[PDB]
From a paper:
A subfamily of autotransporters, including AIDA-I (adhesin involved in diffuse adherence) from diffusely adhering E. coli (DAEC) 2787 and TibA from enterotoxigenic E. coli (ETEC) H10407, are glycosylated in their passenger domains, which functions in bacterial autoaggregation and adhesion to host cells. Here we determine the crystal structures of TibC heptosyltransferase, both alone and in complex with ADP-D-glycero-β-D-manno-heptose (ADP-D,D-heptose). All the 12 TibC protomers adopt an identical structure containing an N-terminal β-barrel domain, a core catalytic domain, a β-hairpin thumb, and an iron-finger motif which are arranged into a palm-like shape.
We also crystallized the TibC dodecamer in complex with its natural ligand ADP-D-glycero-β-D-manno-heptose (ADP-D,D-heptose). This was accomplished by soaking the sugar ligand into crystals of the catalytically inactive TibC D110A mutant. ADP-D,D-heptose is located at the cleft between the two lobes of the catalytic domain. The adenine heterocycle fits snugly into a hydrophilic pocket and its N1 atom bears a hydrogen bond contact with Arg-286 of TibC. The hydrogen bond contact, though weak, is incompatible with a guanine due to its saturated N1, providing a structural basis for the specificity of TibC in using ADP-activated sugar donor. Asp-110 is located close to the anomeric hydroxyl of heptose in the TibC–ADP-D,D-heptose complex structure. In TibC, residue 300 is a proline and its main-chain carbonyl oxygen forms two hydrogen bonds with D,D-heptose hydroxyl O4 and O6, respectively.
Residue numbers in the entry:
A (entry chain G): 11 to 399
B (entry chain K): 9 to 398
C (entry chain J): 9 to 393
The structure:
C-alpha cells in the first residue's frame, strides 16, 4: 500500500509523490496540472482540477515531470522531475513464488546500479534468506514490515494479465514473464541469474541427477504416461543416482494427483532453499519443469533440461537442453488471445475436457528427453563443465 | 464370442430340427404348424404362435427347462413333444472374452450346474484362465472360443454381464443381485458366492511377513483417487514390519493426461506373468489390499484376508469381507445404480459428477486413516488369533 | 415412535450441551461460535459453519463415530472436542411400533451392536415382541416406546425402512441391500443376516407329521394370486401324508371387494394368539410354506425348512432358503425397484400393471405345479437326509 499522503512537500501545501506512478495532492483552489515524460518531453496528461487527486495512468518506471499551474499563470508553481539518486526507493514483489522472484530480481539490482538510489525490496522471508547475503547494497524486508515508511518512489513488479498496459509497458506474454520486470523498471531487459552461496562442499560422492516433477498447475506437469519412468531408468543405466527435490511428494486437485515417481530418491519436503542450492550445485545436471526449481537450478550453474510444452522455448531462460514439441497444441499460456484461469487446474483453451487435453506435453515422449539427455551426457563426458556453461 | 450352430443339433421326426443353444430353438420345414414353448417346471405357456416356416426361438436365453411342442394345424396331439434333459448330454457354457475377476466369480456356478444335472460340460474362455483352473476341475472340459471341441452341443448358455437392464439373457438385472451371482441366476443354481479351487501347494519363497497390493484397474472410478492414500497405507504397513509388493499387470496405466503409476515405496512385482505365479506369491502373503479389480478375487481364492477398497460399488456387490472399506457420506455405488448406465468407452466415467469439483469424490472420501484403521484391526486379529480368524 | 430429549444429555464446559441422539447434536448458548463435525475414523470434516446460538445437527442420523468440535471464532484450539464413545454408556435403539418380520429380521443386528461397543443398550418395541425375545436376550433391556427407562440417553439410533431413496437416516437405500440387512448398515455392524434366538424348549403336541402355512398378507401383492395354487399345494401335501394348518392371524383379510380367506382343506389355527404359541407349534412342524410376511421370519427362527412364495420381491430381498419359489418370466420385484415407490395407503398396489389384465402377474405365474415341485424336492430331502 502507498502512503495516504504524498511523501514530498511542495510550495503552498501541495504534496507530490512517485509511489503509485506520479501522484500529486492539491489543497483548495483552481489548478492546471500537467504530467510530462522528461525524456521525450511529451505531455502525458493535462487537465484542469480544483482540488482532487491527480495520478498518471502509467505505473511503471517513467522519468515523470510534474507541473502544477495556477489557472492562467505563464510559469509553473511546481515543476519537479523524477530524480532517484540517494533517494528512498521501494520495489515491491508479491508474496513469494519462487522462480518468478529469481527471474525478476536481477533487474532490481540493475535498477539500483543505474540510478544509484537507496533501494528496499519487499518479498517473502525464505527468498530474503536466500539472496540477502550476496546483495549487501540492497535492503531486504517483508511486505508487512517495510523500513522506509516514506519512500520517494515505489515500483510494483509482477504479472499483470488481461493484456494490462498501465502497470507494465508491454504484455509479459510478448517479451517473457521474467524480462517484463526489466521493462517495468526500464533497464537492460536481458535475462540473468541471481547470485547464490555456492560455497557448500560436496556431500554425495557418486554422480547424481536432480529432478523436479511437481508444479502449481497441471498443464506444466509432464503428462506423458511413461515419461518420467523411462527417463529415470535411463539415467540409472548411465550410472546416475536420481533424486526428487520437490517440496511436496504428492500434489494435485480433485482426482488428478501427481506423486514422486517410483525409483527416484525421496529428497522432498519443505526445506530452506539454501539446502536445495547446496544439493543442486554438485549435481551432474537438473531435469525440471518450468516451475521455480528450474530457475534455482539455473542459478547454481548446472546444465538444465527443461521439459515444457505449455510454454514456448523463448519464454524462460535459454538452455540448449530445452525439450519441446511443435506438432500439436503448444504455448497455450503464451497466446495473447487466451487468458489464464487462476481457479482452474483444468483449463485448456483447445482441448480441455477432450481427448487431446494436455497434448502440449503428452507428445513429449521419454525417448525425446532421453535423446537430449544422451547429447548432454556425451557433452559432459567428452568435454567438461566448461563446454556447457 | 459364441456362435450357435446354423442348424439345430437334434433331429425331430418330420424333418423338424430342435435345439437348446441360444435358448430353445426349433427350425421347421415348409408347411402349416402351431408351435408352443412351455416351462416344464411351472407348466406355463411361455410362447404361443402360428408359423408356416422358419425359425422359432424363445425370447429367454438363460436356463429354463423348456418344453417344445410342435403341432400340425388342427391336431389334438403334438408331432414333437420334447422336454429339456441334460443328463449325459453335451452342454457348452461360454464365458465372455476373458477378464480376471469376473471369471473367478462366475466359474464356481458352472461346476454346480454340472454337478446338479450330471451333464458333459465344456467351458470356453481365454487360455491363461484355463491354465489356472483346468487341473483342479477335471470333470469339466476347458477350451478356447475359436477351438470348441463340441461341434454339435445339446444346450448352450452364455454367462456374461448384460447392461441396460436386459431381462432376456439374464433373469434379473445383475446390478440387483451382484454381477457375479448373476451367473448363478442364469444357470438356475445356488446363487451364493464361492471361491474357485486353485493350486495352493507352492512353497514359501519370501521368509519375512509381507503384504500384496493392487493399485491398477480398467476404469478410473475403481482406483483409489485419494491423494495421499496409498502412500500413507504403505508407510503404515512398513511401520508394522511388513514388506509391500505391487502385483498389478501394468506399472503404468491410464488415458489422456490421467495416468496411474505404481506407488513409491512398493516393491516392483508388476508385469505380465502367468496367474499361477501370482497365486504362489499371494498365498504366503499376510494379507492383500486391493481394488474391486480381479486380483482381489484371485486373492480371495488364495484364502488370505482381503482388504477391498472401493466406493464406486456397494459392499454387497462383491464377495463378502469384514475388511471391506467403504464411505457413505458422498457419491457412491454408481455401478449398482439401475437408473445409470456404464460406459465401456469412457475411462473417466462418473455419471453424476464428471467434470466437476466432486468427480470421483466417493473414492476420495476414503482417507488413508480409514484404511489404516481397518488394517490395524486386521493386524491385531492376525497377531492375537492367527489365521483361524474369519 | 419416539422423541429425542429437547435438551442434549451431555454437559460441556461453557454451558454448551452436546448429544448423540438423532445424529450428533449440539446446542450453543449466546455468543459467536465456529462448530465442526468430523468422522473420527476417516478424519473427514463432515460439517463446518459459523453459528450464533441455536441447534447444530449432522444431516446423517445413522451410526457414525462423530467428533464434535466447538471453536471460538478466532481460536486455534477447540473449546469442546468430544468424540463418540459408547462403552458403558446409555444407548437407545428405537424400532417402530413395529411389524413382525421386520423386527425379527432387524433385532440380531442390535445384539451385535451391543457386543461390539460393550454399551448399556435399551430397545423400544411393541409388547408382544418383547415377550417373545426378552428372556433369551438378558444383556439387553426391553421397553415400550411410551415407557422408556433411560430418560437421558447418550446416543439414540432409529432403525426402520426409509422410502424415497433416503440416505440421511440410512447409509444405503434398503432396496439395494435388503430391508433387514439395512439395520446392520445403520448400526455399522456385520450386515450378514441372522435368526433371532427363541424358546425352542416346548414339547411336541401333535404326533402326526404336519405342515404350517401362512396365506394372508398386508398388501395384495405379497399374496399368492394364482387361482388354484394353495388348493393344489394343500391337496398335494395331504397326499404325501401331511396335516395342513393355517397359522395366520386373520382368517379373512382384504379391502374393498378383494378379500382373501383361509383356504378350504386347511385346518383353522388362526386368531390373535401370543407369538410363543406360534413358535411352539411351528417348531415341530415338518416344514413351513409362507409368504414374505413375518410368519416366514418366525418360521425361519424356529429352525425349520421354509418354502417362501413371492414374486413381488427378489430372491435376495429376504433370508436365504433353497426352497425359494420365484418366477422370472413376467413382472417381478415391484418392491426392490429403486425407480418405483411403495404406497402404504394402497392395498391393491402394483405400480406397473394396476387395473390391467396383468395385475399381480408377479405371483400369478407361480403355479401350483412349481411349488409342488419344490415341495417334492424338500420332501425327498427330509425322508432321505
Ligand atoms: N520451499 C521449497 N523447497 C523446495 N522446493 C520448493 C519450495 N517451494 C516451492 N518449491 C518447488 O517449486 C514449485 C513452486 O514454483 P513457483 O511457485 O515458483 O512457480 P509458479 O507456478 O508460480 O511459476 C512457475 O511457472 C512458470 C510459467 O512458465 C509462467 O508462465 C514461471 O515462469 C515461473 O514463475 C515458475 O515458478 C513447487 O511446486 C515445488 O516443486
Ligand atoms: N496376468 C496378470 N497378472 C497380474 N495381474 C493381472 C493379469 N492380468 C490382468 N491383471 C490385473 O487385473 C486387473 C484388471 O482385471 P479385472 O477383470 O479385474 O478388472 P476390470 O478392470 O476389467 O474390472 C473389474 O471389475 C470388477 C467389478 O467392478 C467388481 O466390483 C470385476 O469383478 C472384475 O472381474 C473386473 O471387471 C488389473 O489390475 C490388471 O493389471
Ligand atoms: N398376533 C399375531 N399372532 C400370530 N401372527 C400374527 C399376529 N399378527 C400378525 N401376524 C402375522 O404376521 C403378519 C404381520 O405383517 P408383516 O409385518 O409380516 O408384514 P408387512 O406387510 O408389514 O411387511 C412385511 O413384508 C415382508 C416382505 O417380504 C418384504 O419385502 C417382510 O419380510 C416382513 O418382515 C414384513 O415387512 C400378518 O400378516 C400375519 O400373517
Ligand atoms: Fe495446452
Ligand atoms: Fe461416482
Ligand atoms: Fe408387480
Amino acid at each position: 500500500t502507498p502512503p495516504d499522503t504524498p511523501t514530498q512537500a511542495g510550495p503552498e501545501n501541495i504534496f507530490y509523490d512517485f509511489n503509485d506512478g506520479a501522484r500529486v495532492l492539491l489543497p483548495e483552489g483552481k489548478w492546471h496540472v500537467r504530467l510530462l515524460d522528461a525524456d521525450s518531453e511529451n505531455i502525458l496528461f493535462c487537465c484542469d482540477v480544483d482540488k482532487g487527486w491527480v495520478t498518471s495512468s502509467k505505473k511503471y518506471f517513467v522519468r515523470f515531470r510534474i507541473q502544477v499551474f495556477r489557472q492562467g499563470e505563464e510559469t509553473p508553481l511546481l515543476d519537479e522531475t523524477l530524480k532517484l539518486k540517494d533517494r528512498p526507493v521501494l520495489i515491491s514483489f508479491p508474496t513469494g513464488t519462487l522462480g518468478a522472484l529469481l527471474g525478476w530480481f536481477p533487474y532490481a539490482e540493475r535498477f539500483q546500479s543505474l540510478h544509484k538510489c537507496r533501494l528496499e525490496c519487499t518479498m517473502s522471508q525464505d527468498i530474503i534468506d536466500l539472496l540477502a547475503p550476496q546483495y549487501p547494497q540492497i535492503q531486504f524486508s517483508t511486505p508487512d514490515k517495510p523500513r522506509t515508511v516514506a519512500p520517494y518512489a515505489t515500483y510494483r513488479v509482477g504479472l499483470y494479465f488481461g493484456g494490462d498496459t498501465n502497470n507494465q509497458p508491454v504484455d509479459f506474454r510478448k517479451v517473457g514473464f521474467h524480462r517484463s520486470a526489466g521493462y517495468i523498471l526500464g533497464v537492460d531487459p536481458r535475462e540473468a541469474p541471481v547470485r547464490l552461496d555456492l560455497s557448500a562442499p560436496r556431500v554425495i560422492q557418486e554422480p547424481y541427477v536432480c529432478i523436479a516433477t511437481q508444479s502449481t498447475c497441471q498443464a506444466k506437469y509432464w503428462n506423458n504416461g511413461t515419461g518420467w519412468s523411462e527417463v529415470i531408468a535411463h539415467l540409472k543405466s548411465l550410472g546416475y543416482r536420481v533424486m526428487c527435490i520437490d517440496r511436496d511428494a504428492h500434489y494435485g486437485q480433485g482426482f488428478v494427483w501427481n506423486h514422486i515417481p517410483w525409483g527416484a530418491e525421496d529428497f522432498t519436503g519443505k526445506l530452506p532453499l539454501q539446502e536445495r542450492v547446496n544439493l543442486l550445485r554438485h549435481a551432474s545436471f537438473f531435469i525440471g519443469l518450468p516451475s521455480g526449481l528450474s530457475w534455482l537450478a539455473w542459478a547454481t550453474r548446472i546444465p538444465v533440461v527443461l521439459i515444457s510444452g505449455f510454454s514456448l522455448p523463448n519464454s524462460e531462460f535459454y538452455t540448449p537442453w530445452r525439450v519441446f514439441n511443435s506438432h500439436g497444441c503448444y504455448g497455450c499460456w503464451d497466446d495473447t488471445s487466451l487468458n489464464f484461469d487462476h481457479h482452474d487446474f483444468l483449463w485448456c483453451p483447445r482441448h480441455k475436457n477432450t481427448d487431446r487435453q494436455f497434448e502440449c506435453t503428452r507428445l513429449i515422449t521419454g525417448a525425446q528427453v532421453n535423446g537430449v539427455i544422451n547429447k548432454l551426457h556425451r557433452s559432459l563426458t567428452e568435454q567438461g563443465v566448461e563446454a556447457t556453461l
